[PDB]
Structure 1
């Protein structure tokens, strides 16, 4: 019931809305990580920026 989200791609060259979603997930710099409880809202954020992040069931 917890996911670890890692920012594996740069936000450079990405539209502002994707950058805002990445910021809302708590990810700061490239290869930084967060651990958050799984719920539909977090899943929606991840789906929006899934080409930029890696998800591990943690």
Structure 2
């Protein structure tokens, strides 16, 4: 399942468990839209980052 991921809130000030999981999705600017296919791995990457990332169904 294709799945948009955007940054509604930046990376400054969050701890660096909440940066690498942001980084390993390729996110490197706010409101950058990197679309990976949905998977139980990647659904577990948005659990740790939920106050920061909006998912989107495709």
Partner-residue secondary structure (3-state), 1:28:
coil
TM-aligned CA deviation for residue 24 of structure 1: 0.6
Structure 2 portions without partners, runs of 5+: none
Runs of 4+ in 1 over 2 A off after TM superposition: none
TM-score, normalization by structure 1: 0.93
Q: Which runs of 5+ in 1 are unaligned?
A: none
Number of aligned residue pairs = 58
Between structures 1 and 2, the one with greater helix share: 1
TM-score (norm 2): 0.93
1:10-29 superposed matches below 5 A: 10-29=10-29
> What is the CA RMSD across the aligned residues, in angstroms?
0.7
Normalized per residue, which structure has more strand?
1
